[PDB]
Amino acid sequence: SLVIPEKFQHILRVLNTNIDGRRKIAFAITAIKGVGRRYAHVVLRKADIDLTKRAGELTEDEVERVITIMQNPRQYKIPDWFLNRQKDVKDGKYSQVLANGLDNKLREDLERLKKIRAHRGLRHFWGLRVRGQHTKTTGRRGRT
Amino acid sequence: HRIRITLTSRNVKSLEKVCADLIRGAKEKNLKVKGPVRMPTKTLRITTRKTPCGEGSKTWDRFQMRIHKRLIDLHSPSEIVKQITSISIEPGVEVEVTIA
Amino acid sequence: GVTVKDVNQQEFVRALAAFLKKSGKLKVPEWVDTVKLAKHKELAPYDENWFYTRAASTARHLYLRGGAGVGSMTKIYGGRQRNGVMPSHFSRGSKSVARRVLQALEGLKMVEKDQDGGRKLTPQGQRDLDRIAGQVAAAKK
Amino acid sequence: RDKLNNLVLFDKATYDKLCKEVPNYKLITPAVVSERLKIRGSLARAALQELLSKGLIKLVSKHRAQVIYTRNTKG
Amino acid sequence: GPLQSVQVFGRKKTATAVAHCKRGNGLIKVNGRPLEMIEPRTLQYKLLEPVLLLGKERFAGVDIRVRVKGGGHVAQIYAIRQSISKALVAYYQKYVDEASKKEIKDILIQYDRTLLVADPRRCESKKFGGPGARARYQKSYR
Amino acid sequence: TPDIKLFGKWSTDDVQINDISLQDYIAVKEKYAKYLPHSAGRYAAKRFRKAQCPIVERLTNSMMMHGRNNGKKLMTVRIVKHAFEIIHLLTGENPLQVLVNAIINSGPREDSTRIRRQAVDVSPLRRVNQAIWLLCTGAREAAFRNIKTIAECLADELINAAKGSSNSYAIKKKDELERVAKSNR
Amino acid sequence: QPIKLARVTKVLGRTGSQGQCTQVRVEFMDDTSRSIIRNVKGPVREGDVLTLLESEREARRL
Amino acid sequence: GRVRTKTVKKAARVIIEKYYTRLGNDFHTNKRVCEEIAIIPSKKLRNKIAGYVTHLMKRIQRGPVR
RNA sequence: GUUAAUUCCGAUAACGAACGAGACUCUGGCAUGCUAACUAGUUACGCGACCCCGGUCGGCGUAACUUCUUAGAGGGACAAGUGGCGUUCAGCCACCCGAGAUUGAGCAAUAACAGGUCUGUGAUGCCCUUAGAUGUCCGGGGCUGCACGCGCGCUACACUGACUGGCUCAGCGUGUGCCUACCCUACGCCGGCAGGCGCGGGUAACCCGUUGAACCCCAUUCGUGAUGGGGAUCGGGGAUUGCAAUUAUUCCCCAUGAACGAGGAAUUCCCAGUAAGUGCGGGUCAUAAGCUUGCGUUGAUUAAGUCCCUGCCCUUUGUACACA
């Protein structure tokens, strides 16, 4: 309870990303890319998980119940609007992608934009503001 | 019989002189007169820059139109109303008479 | 006894939610556990039974004044939309989250639609409203 | 620069020296408890509710931003 | 019996609150709820100086109801502090002697003068060329 | 209670001012007792209307500084209210007296000024305001980026400034501002 | 050099470069006869007492 | 500065030398005495002239005026 | 001498005068005194709902009233009374009494800049083009472009706080268009939301609206961690207006989570509801506030002095300056 339980997990090596046991369960998932403060909270309610404990007390069998909701949201009826990748470019899959496929997914669409030679791709090539920002007064620090 | 007369005028004393004039005209015929209801005015705020160009210090206007409306209720048919309302009227006052 | 104006509204909201515990027939929507309560919110509430708490908080709003509609409930349950880098402005609440409460309050009879629209609280909804009001005033004495 | 490596859950020693010396201190608040015990403020706040139930500390003034606790009555 | 009804208005920066004295029992309520139960609860005893510094026995024969609108929170509490102190002043002036009314007034005179004479402080107009009524924008040289 | 008032629970009476120079510029007794450290205002209108304002209100009004806290007397009254039990549950005496003892021991006698600086004695009103001011900003800095809350920080220094153990921030600048004045005099 | 108390008996005028100090003719509550001149910062009325560290330093009259 | 201008002062000089019996001492009576016997376009000047008259009253019973 | 004042007193080869200041217009504030209100409310009667004779209800219809709503006529404040200073004149300070014993803004003199505006004009002298036009109109782009510097601004650097719930309060206003094809919104459904669909009200004290604003108050989580601070950059998806959004027009959801640990030289504004915090109206708007213009909430520290600096107004003085 208030004293330390048995079976300590300090770092949870989950999908080759460290998860601290010092933080709460509701926000230690956020260190994984592809899940933030919002998408981690709904997962604690898809499965019957109490969020009032720490990330060093929860048991090893049901943390497998947590991570199967990461890459497979639809069979646990997670709606499509929580997903970082809705209507994927190749296979059109409504899915959530977590910190390892996430940056794999990140480097097709950049040279997919480069090979089409679109304006959105070109601004990434010279590293300029693609969303339509003013570069006359801002954007100085990384560019010398 | 329940006739509404609307008294709108830009000048304060042009509206005030006619709002009491209809009281004097109607009390001679000695019928049921309601008092003039003073309802809150509308003022027209316009703030523009004084300089025709954009050069110089930033100064702003305060252009205003206060408009006043007075409502007086009469319990009479329209024969009495059509006689008095044509006497002593001035163009600063816009008069609207509603039979209903 | 006393009405709800003699009862503090801070602990009144879960006292009527406790009345909603013993009923347990509010036919709550499926998306209670996974929705964001407004566009100016960013995360989900910490309290799980927020639907049973807001519906209890909706009933005490309808007792003070009637004729309230969907837009009126979004206005009171709105708040500051912290726009981040932009200045913060007031924003309205979510529409369906208040639409389901008034639909939950008409499922089990606590509200009826007043003339010219709106939602007003039924006399029997006021009748048991005084019983939970008297149980708190007797508790504090 | 100075990183506060605070303690997340009570050791056997810390839970032992919470049951004895804390009911000797005249001022118990979760702000100083997390500072003095070298623990988190979540652990400091969670440590003070059961002492209220155990009858070792007394609440005199509670608030959303600050809660204050003292010793038991001297008599 | 006779209708000993006294209606006394209270004004503030924007909040206006009107008390309603009558010959009745010793209960005080504003907008249908008593003086004890008003959020913000930081200022509870500010509603009590008319009660504490004059006594509950002075309010035994008078019941008051206050209708409050306008302004903000602290304007409304400061409205209903001074609206209800003037309410008891006018009740004991019209129906009984002011010898009793002057000896409750001088208690309120020596404590705080806002209870009877309202503060004529109001927000003055904002002028052009500045974000506030007095402050101006940052003047840039060169 | 038309005869006596209680500041929440604290006594109107038995608060003593040690130094006789500041007894006219500390408003705590027999005319300036109020239930709250909040009032209507108007004491900033005249030059010398400032002296008769209650010192608990003056410390409250000097507290909501540094930007985001400006115009927040409703919450600084909450800070002041909780801070008095911390005094009563650390030392055990009247917090009004401990606040009074902190004003005298944090107020410099002489101070230097540009007229090569010449040391001139401060006003008894000037000694009150600077003593209030030095113990307030220290609570602002101690509560900044620290687990210890603002309510504790107010009660820490004025307890320390009452005894003058050179650990409050107000004591050190009071020593330094007179040490500088002691040099070039 | 004991701590002494000095009671203001009449004010003279504003002194200093910015008018930041008030030159005050000041009397002593320890003895009525002996009394000196000192410049005082801050707003000072009639009927208040000062706390001079030493009574041997006297301000000149401008 | 509450210094009376020449328009207020010169208007108050003619009233005293013409209406010595009509003028009183207190402010409010000769305020109304000067209301009928002077065409003053505004109430503010009516108080200012009568107020300056009252200040000249205290000079009259204490001796002559230049 | 006095004043905010060439404001007066008083002297006087100056006198009589004129503009300006003052005066004057609007607003604020005090009058249970006057007029009036069924597009504003209050008080009583009679019910209805609930609780144990009484209490509450923006629940319902009646008679009196303007205390709360409104705007009209008057009044009120004048250094008026007192104690002092002062030629005892001009006037000044303090006090009683009193809502005020200095509210704020408008207007504003002679002369001058070669200040800015010809891109506001069917204001225009003169110069230029005028049919392959420097004239009209259409398609696209751009004015936003980015090694850098500067100016006005918004958001943070957190625990006085971030988050999640509950509680509880405003006033300025505005709203269906001559051309004009385009209004503000109640209420009832669909969708998490952006938003989509139906019916009505309001040309406006009627409907929005009793403008259920932030702020504030109460109760959890976080625990000094670049942390649930912070939201820059950026990916994917969904909606509105428009003929058309890519150089992301905007809005909504998920995700990415940088600098920034209170800011050097130097510099800006302000003393009373003032600063500062915080939200709401209007402008530009088909789509639209980081700006600006007003309104409203919370609401102070300091000072009632000075020419030290920056400057301004008189008098004397000196000048080899007079585009000074």
UniProtKB/Swiss-Prot annotation, chain B:
One of its GO terms (molecular function) is structural constituent of ribosome. The chain holds residues 18 to 117 of 119 of the full protein. Keywords: Acetylation, Cytoplasm, Isopeptide bond, Phosphoprotein, Ribonucleoprotein, Ribosomal protein, Ubl conjugation. The modification N6-acetyllysine is found at residues 17, 58. One of its GO terms (cellular component) is small ribosomal subunit. Its main location: cytoplasm. Component of the 40S small ribosomal subunit. The modification Phosphoserine is found at residue 76. Belongs to the universal ribosomal protein uS10 family. It comes from Oryctolagus cuniculus (Rabbit). Component of the small ribosomal subunit. The ribosome is a large ribonucleoprotein complex responsible for the synthesis of proteins in the cell. This is Small ribosomal subunit protein uS10. Polyubiquitinated by ZNF598 via 'Lys-63'-linked ubiquitin chains when a ribosome has stalled, initiating the ribosome quality control (RQC) pathway to degrade the potentially detrimental aberrant nascent polypeptide. Deubiquitinated by OTUD3 and USP21, antagonizing ZNF598 activity. GO terms for biological process: translation. It comes from the Eukaryota. It is found in: Cytoplasm.
UniProtKB/Swiss-Prot annotation, chain D:
One of its GO terms (cellular component) is postsynaptic density. Keywords: Acetylation, Cytoplasm, Ribonucleoprotein, Ribosomal protein. The modification N6-succinyllysine is found at residues 12, 54. The modification N6-acetyllysine is found at residues 3, 12, 20, 26, 54. This is Small ribosomal subunit protein eS25. Belongs to the eukaryotic ribosomal protein eS25 family. Component of the small ribosomal subunit. Component of the small ribosomal subunit. The ribosome is a large ribonucleoprotein complex responsible for the synthesis of proteins in the cell. Its main location: cytoplasm. It is found in: Cytoplasm. The chain holds residues 40 to 114 of 124 of the full protein. One of its GO terms (molecular function) is structural constituent of ribosome. One of its GO terms (biological process) is ribosomal small subunit biogenesis.
From Swiss-Prot, chain F:
The modification Phosphoserine is found at residue 123. The modification N6-acetyllysine is found at residue 34. Keywords: Acetylation, Cytoplasm, Isopeptide bond, Nucleus, Phosphoprotein, Ribonucleoprotein, Ribosomal protein, Ubl conjugation. The modification Phosphothreonine is found at residue 1. GO terms for biological process: translation. One of its GO terms (cellular component) is small ribosomal subunit. It comes from the Eukaryota. GO terms for molecular function: RNA binding; structural constituent of ribosome. It is found in: Cytoplasm; Nucleus, Nucleolus. This is Small ribosomal subunit protein uS7. The gene is RPS5.
Swiss-Prot record, chain G:
The keyword 4Fe-4S does not apply. Its main location: cytoplasm. One of its GO terms (molecular function) is structural constituent of ribosome. The modification Phosphoserine is found at residue 35. It holds the Pfam family Ribosomal_S28e. Disulfide bonds: none annotated. GO terms for cellular component: cytosolic ribosome; cytosolic small ribosomal subunit; nucleolus; rough endoplasmic reticulum; small-subunit processome; synapse. The keyword Phosphoprotein applies. Gene3D superfamilies: Nucleic acid-binding proteins. CDD domains: S1_S28E. It is found in: Cytoplasm, Cytosol; Cytoplasm; Rough endoplasmic reticulum; Nucleus, Nucleolus. Keywords: Acetylation, Cytoplasm, Endoplasmic reticulum, Nucleus, Phosphoprotein, Ribonucleoprotein, Ribosomal protein. SUPFAM superfamilies: Nucleic acid-binding proteins. One of its GO terms (biological process) is cytoplasmic translation. HAMAP family: Ribosomal_eS28. Component of the 40S small ribosomal subunit. Part of the small subunit (SSU) processome, composed of more than 70 proteins and the RNA chaperone small nucleolar RNA (snoRNA) U3. Belongs to the eukaryotic ribosomal protein eS28 family. This is Small ribosomal subunit protein eS28. The lineage of its organism: Eukaryota, Metazoa, Chordata, Craniata, Vertebrata. The gene is RPS28.
